[PDB]
């Protein structure tokens, strides 16, 4: 094996920002690289548009104009000339540029302001696309990536991408089919779930069921493809049609691709446009809405390397090819899910029975605590109702965090006290057994169905364990699987930690006086790790959610099965002495014919059921196509359109007020700290500003220092429902609000939802506010 | 129907008649997480174990008190007005419907003491909303 | 009554079905969701006996039926009055089959007898 | 005229006091349970041996909604 | 911004005006704004119209 594409699974996220480098973002290629970066700009800024518009001037433009200032309200071919000169037609439709110079009458400033206005209207505050860069790496006499391909004169690389969306063709998402799949257990899912029927898999009917026969259902699939090479950096759109080919048809931009002269491919997702074929078809279900399409997609990434000496190298087999999937935006990019999609890859390789042989370092346990700690910025329960996060604050306040790194007997009760609060993914605790036919009924807090029964609830006898998030089994009141547990292999790490059976280096201990100091240390370990290919593979996936799956945010339950990978091997620690959950070489199973596969349009008839998944396990079986992905297969499971599923991915209220359960808050926040509040605690009393923290200079400085600092903390503590950061149907007199209007309105309002970004507090004084806060920006403001 | 009327702008949130039908209240759950001083000789202090509460710095202890004090809950959420449960619709109309039975379970605000506010910034008299408890 | 082609060719696959009133957990507490009653009537007395249960069981009385025996020994069984109701007025029955918080006075059950001749 | 037949339901002789009066299949029922119930020695066979309430429990609750 | 065809006009060589109404296209500015009231639906427009018809006659003698 000679050349390989990284990452093996690339991720690009939709956004209404433009598909150009200066105004877009890049999928992480190193884990934890920007966690505290207070200069991040995830929304298009005025300054970026102004720079873009300056860049587009002269060029001779200044005196190509001034030349007709003398030669005179403009003409067409007068203006047609002075458009075009600014290469701005690829950002705004040509006509609207013309209409903007029409209402005109120093003139190379009436020209700018008029053009800035149209750029601003289209893009100001827009959700920047998160594009994925793909790289070719030269390999070894062992398939080990050594260095990126360096093109010399005469060398050429050609990328090919083929993507599809089959959501409108596939089945309803009622719950994860693998919840009933017979298993011996993996690192991601205990055999107890299926063995004891904790959350039975449901049957699922077809989406768009009125379209009958396989031939006609092919129209429900959106697909496109394109090629780019290192000899031409022109961007190529990936454009399909829905329905595909007196049928009214819609163009769907599934993505855009670019290759630079060094041979690196950049993949942009769509613009975030979802639509029904009729305006009156409303998307009132979280996952299954007929007559709808969206611009999400996924598919196959290949390349061919042409060296000058004639040598040609095809990157097409599943060991060296790659995949791409597009997803909803990440509305808090610096806030990591507690269990990531990379954790699912890692867990998929492990057997539940062998978790006794797992070896644990503290760096394998720290991510759980660090991620849960940082959920405070997106979820109220983790800010004010999480006893572990408050204990971490206790330790931080006396520079005592390093005690958690102590594996000795004197710290055992400290470690155990934290470990004992976490939910056990065996799902066999806090239960009473009917008929020890056996049913496991939770004696902790359940999450009720909306379908009420006016009968007294059974009092909970056992505390609610951590984390406080719903899970795959939410449909079943009293199932332990209603609530999320870190997966078996990660729980094993934490159990080994509690027991004291873990190692840690002295150097780690010396950077561990607070959780932030240690997180900064580990971030440097990623940054300096020399395996850029595998770090890039992990970084693509460590920002994605890895549970619960109902269906999820980006991808869903098939990813937690080793069946979906053609390769999944441990390679190494991140650092010789520091594992940090490790680096792995993994590749998806792929159908090598791509869009031309005869299995492109397979299904299981009127329903899908776990029996079909059971039959697919055998790779020689007729049903094994389920795991050998063709374009569209990773995302077809997800909600159609994604916006409704995102609006449904929020809080699930219990009769008890607190803690408020939240589904996926790290990527779809539930409770955020608005910009309005940041502007009321940002400043110190000494600030040289006529307005300080929303007060007149005179009032801010007249109050006592203690009172001034108390007001800061009060503002800092006001967290706003993320669903209220744009108009989701609750605005206005007698507005209905409610769940369903959220689903409907998210189709247009997703691009106006608050985006969380790290920001500085220069002098918190004794206020208790950290120097880096995570602030939610939306136009609802303030 | 006598509650908030949201504008496109987030803040200030308009409220109709909040003195008699409150809109955002300070729940008992939060009161029980700031009413105690760090010297309290109890196994649980402000919702923390004795060991954790007394292990932290005095500054951090007071900061936690004020954070809890600052958590205000929508009064409409102090009983089940149609928003509870998986895929509950919630919304304005269910509130109207459910209040016929749930009015008697809505939170009732009562003055309560903070014996030793210390330097927390919490006043010696706070007004706390009790519901179901 | 049913051809083997329906199942064999997957013409209408059976669906999974969740529990009604799913917020009532544990078999012991779900027993409250069952309404039941019994009675006896004899040849010697034609007084009508109601079959009256409660919902939730051990709060509304549910008349599931009435029974009568005439001096000839024939039993006459009357069903209920056709009263269906939710435990809360705001719980509306918007699904064709599955509405939580609802009860009705439909029932079915077991009919037995003993014949006591004069010779013992 | 399609004939006359002698037929009788399977009955649990304990009726309201049967230990299977309150049996179910857990969080969902599925055809798998019915398949298992075919075997008269299975822990699912009780499905066919009716206790009071077993004939009408499948129907719509309340019946009026189903009728509409 | 939406284009609304309110009608079409034709005149023949005899001088008779023929007036066609629109195509019957009604629409809201957002697809989620549904017209649930018999008469008053915000955010909606239709292609109905009415207005003023005038003419000038020009004879060959001026
Ligand atoms: Mg995130
Ligand atoms: Mg009052």
DSSP, residue by residue, A484-511: ----HHHHHHHHHHHHT--B--HHHHHT
Minimum Cα–Cα distance from A198: chain D residue:
D27
Contact partners for chain A, using 3 or more CB pairs closer than 8 A, are B, C, D, E
Minimum Cα–Cα distance from D57: chain C residue:
C107
Q: Which of A199, A203, A437 sits opposite D27 (nearest CB)?
A: A199
Deposited experimental method: X-ray
Minimum Cα–Cα distance from C89: chain A residue:
A454
What residues of B are in contact with residue A674 (Cβ under 8 Å)? 10-11
Residue A597, preceding bond cis, omega within 30 degrees?
A: no
**Cβ under 8 Å to B: A residues 35-54:** none
Query: In whole angstroms, what is the distance from residue A266 CA to residue A26 CA?
Result: 9
Are A259 and A621 in contact, with CB atoms under 8 Å apart?
Answer: no
Q: What is the DSSP letter of A466?
A: B
Are A374 and A471 in contact, with CB atoms under 8 Å apart?
Answer: no
| Nearest ligand to residue B20 Cα | 2
The dihedral built from the CA positions of residue A51, A56, A60 and A61, taken in this order, carries a sign that is: negative
| A437 contacts D27? CB cut-off 8 A | no
What residues of A are in contact with residue B66 (Cβ under 8 Å)? 710, 713-714, 717, 768
Query: In whole angstroms, what is the distance from residue C94 CA to residue C97 CA?
Result: 9
What residues of B are in contact with residue C90 (Cβ under 8 Å)? 97-98, 100-101
Half-sphere exposure of A752 (CA within 13 A, CB side): 17
Query: In whole angstroms, what is the distance from residue A149 CA to residue A530 CA?
Result: 16
What is the C-alpha R_g of chain E?
A: 18
- CA of B18 relative to ligand 2 center, distance in Å: 8
| A276 contacts E31? CB cut-off 8 A | yes
Contact partners for chain D, using 3 or more CB pairs closer than 8 A, are A, C
Query: In whole angstroms, what is the distance from residue A683 CA to residue A701 CA?
Result: 12
Cα–Cα distance list, A404 to A514, A581, B56 (Å): 10, 18, 15
Q: Does B105 belong to an annotated binding site?
A: no
Ion ligand 1: residues, CB < 5 A? A 330, 332, 335, 666-667
- Backbone angles phi and psi of A510, in degrees to 5: -75, -10
Q: How big is chain B, counted in residues?
A: 133
| D29 contacts C106? CB cut-off 8 A | no
Query: In whole angstroms, what is the distance from residue B114 CA to residue A567 CA?
Result: 62
Instruction: Describe the crossing of helices A515-528 and A362-374 by its angle, rounded to 10 degrees.
Output: 120
- Backbone angles phi and psi of A112, in degrees to 5: -65, -60
Q: With b meaning 16 or more CB within 10 Å and e meaning fewer, what string describes A118-139? A: bbbebbbbbbbbbbbbbbbbbb
| C90 contacts B97? CB cut-off 8 A | yes
Q: How big is chain A, counted in residues?
A: 782
Query: In whole angstroms, what is the distance from residue A518 CA to residue A532 CA?
Result: 22
- Residue in A272, A96, A140 with CA at minimum distance from that of residue A747: A272
Query: In whole angstroms, what is the distance from residue E33 CA to residue A331 CA?
Result: 27
Query: In whole angstroms, what is the distance from residue A763 CA to residue A49 CA?
Result: 31
Which run of H or E residues covers position A394? helix A387-397
- Residue in E43, B24, C25, E49 with CA at minimum distance from that of residue A448: C25
Two tokens, residue A433: 């057994």
What residues of C are in contact with residue D15 (Cβ under 8 Å)? 109-110
Gap from A748 CA to chain E (nearest CA, Å): 9
- A·C CB contacts under 8 A: 74
The dihedral built from the CA positions of residue A533, A537, A542 and A544, taken in this order, carries a sign that is: positive
- CA of B20 relative to ligand 2 center, distance in Å: 4
Minimum Cα–Cα distance from C23: chain B residue:
B85
Contacts 24+ apart (CB under 8 A), E4-11: E4/E45, E4/E47, E5/E47, E6/E47, E6/E48, E6/E49, E7/E49
Are A322 and A22 in contact, with CB atoms under 8 Å apart?
Answer: no
Are A168 and A640 in contact, with CB atoms under 8 Å apart?
Answer: yes
Beta-carbon contacts of A32 under 8 Å, excluding residues fewer than 6 positions away, are: A336, A519, A522, A523, A526
What residues of E are in contact with residue A747 (Cβ under 8 Å)? 32
- Residue in B26, B99, B79, C23 with CA at minimum distance from that of residue A657: B79
Are A747 and B38 in contact, with CB atoms under 8 Å apart?
Answer: no
Minimum Cα–Cα distance from B85: chain C residue:
C23
Which run of H or E residues covers position A228? strand A222-229
Two tokens, residue C83: 């009263």
CB contact C90 to B (< 8 Å): yes
Peptide-bond breaks in chain A following residues (C–N over 2.5 A): 72, 105, 245, 436
- Residue in A285, A274, A221, A326 with CA at minimum distance from that of residue A641: A274
Are A271 and A295 in contact, with CB atoms under 8 Å apart?
Answer: yes
Two tokens, residue C20: 């009604």
Query: In whole angstroms, what is the distance from residue A56 CA to residue A50 CA?
Result: 10
Residue from E30, E31, E35 whose CB has the most chain A CBs within 10 Å, to mutate: E31
What region, left, alpha or beta, does residue A398 occupy, with left being phi > 0 and alpha being psi -120 to 50 degrees? alpha
Two tokens, residue A688: 């040289």
Q: Are strands A565-572 and A583-588 parallel, antiparallel or unpaired?
A: antiparallel
Are A5 and A301 in contact, with CB atoms under 8 Å apart?
Answer: yes
Gap from A186 CA to chain B (nearest CA, Å): 28
Two tokens, residue D10: 């399977």
Q: With b meaning 16 or more CB within 10 Å and e meaning fewer, what string describes E18-51? A: eeeeeeeeebbeebbeebeeeeeeeeeeebeeee
Cα–Cα distance list, C64 to A298, A439, A455 (Å): 58, 31, 21
CB contact B97 to C (< 8 Å): yes
Peptide-bond breaks in chain B following residues (C–N over 2.5 A): none
**Cα end-to-end span (Å), chain D:** 33
Q: What is the DSSP letter of B43?
A: S
Strands lying side by side in the sheet with C60-69: C49-55, C60-69, C75-79
> Which residue is it, tokens 């940002």?
A682
Are A507 and A515 in contact, with CB atoms under 8 Å apart?
Answer: no
Report how many helices (DSSP H) and strands (DSSP E) chain A contains, helices first: 22, 27
- Residue in A753, A754, A729, A755 with CA at minimum distance from that of residue A741: A729
What residues of E are in contact with residue A744 (Cβ under 8 Å)? 32
Which run of H or E residues covers position B94? helix B91-102
Residues in a beta bridge with A607: A205
- CA of A555 relative to ligand 1 center, distance in Å: 14
| D26 contacts A200? CB cut-off 8 A | yes
Q: What is the DSSP letter of A417?
A: H
- C·D CB contacts under 8 A: 79
Are A330 and A666 in contact, with CB atoms under 8 Å apart?
Answer: no
| A740 contacts B9? CB cut-off 8 A | no
CB contact C57 to A (< 8 Å): no
Q: Which of A397, A706, A730 sits opposite B60 (nearest CB)?
A: A397
* Given resolution (angstroms): 2.0
| Three-class secondary structure of residue A660 per DSSP | coil
């Amino acid at each position: 094996c000679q050349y390989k594409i990284y990452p093996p699974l690339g991720i690009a996220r939709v956004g209404n920002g433009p598909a150009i480098k200066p105004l877009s973002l890049s999928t992480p290629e190193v884990p934890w690289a920007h966690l505290y970066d207070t200069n991040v700009q995830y929304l298009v800024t005025q300054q970026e548009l102004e720079q873009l518009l300056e860049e587009a001037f002269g060029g001779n433009v200044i005196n190509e104009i001034s030349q007709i200032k003398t030669k005179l309200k403009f003409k067409q071919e007068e203006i047609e000339t002075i458009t075009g000169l600014l290469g701005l037609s690829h950002l705004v439709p040509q006509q609207q540029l013309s209409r903007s110079l029409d209402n005109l009458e120093d003139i190379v400033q009436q020209i700018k302001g008029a053009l800035l206005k149209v750029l601003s209207d289209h893009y100001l505050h827009a959700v920047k696309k998160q594009a994925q860069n793909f790289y070719i790496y030269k390999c070894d006499e062992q398939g080990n990536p050594v260095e990126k391909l360096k093109l010399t004169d005469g060398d050429k690389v050609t990328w090919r991408v083929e993507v599809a969306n089959k959501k409108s063709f596939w089945y309803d998402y009622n719950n994860a089919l693998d919840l009933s799949l017979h298993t011996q257990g993996s690192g991601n899912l205990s055999k107890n779930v299926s063995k004891h029927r904790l959350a039975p898999a449901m049957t699922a009917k077809r989406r768009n069921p009125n379209v009958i026969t396989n031939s006609l259902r092919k129209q429900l699939v959106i697909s496109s493809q394109g090629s780019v090479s290192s000899d031409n950096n022109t961007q190529v759109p990936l454009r399909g049609k829905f329905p595909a080919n007196l049928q009214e048809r819609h163009n769907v931009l599934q993505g855009s691709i670019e290759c630079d002269n060094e041979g690196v491919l950049r993949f942009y997702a769509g613009n975030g446009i979802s639509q029904a074929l009729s305006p009156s078809s409303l998307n009132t279900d979280f996952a299954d809405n007929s007559n709808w399409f969206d611009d999400i997609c996924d598919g196959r990434v290949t390349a061919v390397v042409e060296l000058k000496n004639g040598d040609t190298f095809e990157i097409q087999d599943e060991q060296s090819s790659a995949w791409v999937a597009t997803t909803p935006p990440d509305y808090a990019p610096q806030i990591e899910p507690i269990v990531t999609m990379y954790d699912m890859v890692s867990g998929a390789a492990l057997k539940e029975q062998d978790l006794d042989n797992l070896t644990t370092q503290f760096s394998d346990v720290f991510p759980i605590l660090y991620r849960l700690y940082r959920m405070q910025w997106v979820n109220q329960a983790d800010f004010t109702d999480n006893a572990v996060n408050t204990q971490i604050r206790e330790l931080n306040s006396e520079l005592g965090f390093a005690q958690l790194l102590d594996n000795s007997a004197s710290a055992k009760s400290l470690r155990e006290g934290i470990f004992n609060q976490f939910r056990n993914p065996l799902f066999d605790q806090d239960i009473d057994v009917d008929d020890p036919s056996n049913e496991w009924v939770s004696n902790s807090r359940i999450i009720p169905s909306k379908d009420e029964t006016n009968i007294a609830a059974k009092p909970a006898t056992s505390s609610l364990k951590l984390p406080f998030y719903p899970n795959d089994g939410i449909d079943y009141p009293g199932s332990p699987v209603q609530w999320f547990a870190i997966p078996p292999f990660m729980y094993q790490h934490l159990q080994n930690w509690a027991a004291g059976d873990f190692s840690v280096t002295q150097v780690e201990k010396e950077s561990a006086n607070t959780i932030e100091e240690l997180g900064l240390f580990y971030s440097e370990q990623f940054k300096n790790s020399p395996n850029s290919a595998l770090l890039c593979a992990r970084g693509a996936l460590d920002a994605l959610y890895g549970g619960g799956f109902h269906p999820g945010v980006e991808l869903t339950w098939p990813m937690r099965h080793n069946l979906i990978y053609s390769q999944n091997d441990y390679v190494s620690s991140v650092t010789p002495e520091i594992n940090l959950l490790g680096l792995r070489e993994f590749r998806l199973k792929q159908d090598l014919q791509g869009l031309n596969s005869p299995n492109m349009y397979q299904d299981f008839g009127h329903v899908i059921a776990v029996d079909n998944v059971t039959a697919s396990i055998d790779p020689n079986s007729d049903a094994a196509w389920l795991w050998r992905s063709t374009p569209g297969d990773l995302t077809k499971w997800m909600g159609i359109p994604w916006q409704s599923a995102a609006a449904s991915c929020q809080a699930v209220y219990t009769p008890e007020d607190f803690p408020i359960p939240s589904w996926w808050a790290a990527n779809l926040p539930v409770h955020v700290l608005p910009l309005a509040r940041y502007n009321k605690f940002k400043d110190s009393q000494s600030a040289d500003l006529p307005e300080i923290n929303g007060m007149t200079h005179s009032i801010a400085q007249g109050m006592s220092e203690e009172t001034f600092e108390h007001l800061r903390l009060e503002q800092f503590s006001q967290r706003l429902d993320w669903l209220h950061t744009a108009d989701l149907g609750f605005v206005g007199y007698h507005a209905e609000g409610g769940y369903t209007n959220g689903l409907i309105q998210m189709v247009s309002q997703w691009k106006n939802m608050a985006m969380v970004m790290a920001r500085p507090v220069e002098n918190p004084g004794s206020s208790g506010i950290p120097n880096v806060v995570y602030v939610a920006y939306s136009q609802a403001d303030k």
